[PDB]
DNA sequence: TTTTTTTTTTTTTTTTTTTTTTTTTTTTTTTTCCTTTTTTTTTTTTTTTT
C-alpha cells in the first residue's frame, strides 16, 4: 500500500530485502500470520 | 289463581388468531485463536512531623 515500507521498490530492492516481487500485496501481517479481508455483500443504502 | 310467553343467563362449541417449539444428509482432513478484565477493597511502603 501506500503507508508499508515496500511501496514503489523496484525488483532488486525487494529481492535485497527478501521479497517477492511477484507477490501482489493486499494482505495484513497480524501475529506473523498473513491475513486476508474478503469483500462481503450488502444491499444498497439510501436506495428505495 | 294458574298457564304460556318473553327475557335472562349460562353453556358448550367454533373459529380464527397468536404463541410456542422443534427441526434442518453422512464421513473425512488441515490451520488459527483463546482457555479474562477492569473495579473495588486490602495491605504494604514511603514521607513527614513533633
Do not use: H, W
Not at 2 to 8: E, F, H, I, M, P
Not at 11 to 40: H, M, W
Amino acid at each position: 500500500s501506500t503507508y508499508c515500507l515496500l511501496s514503489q521498490l523496484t525488483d532488486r530492492d525487494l529481492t535485497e530485502l527478501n521479497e517477492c516481487p511477484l507477490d501482489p500485496g493486499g494482505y495484513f501481517i497480524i501475529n506473523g500470520s498473513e491475513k486476508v479481508l474478503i469483500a462481503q455483500e450488502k444491499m444498497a443504502t439510501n436506495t428505495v
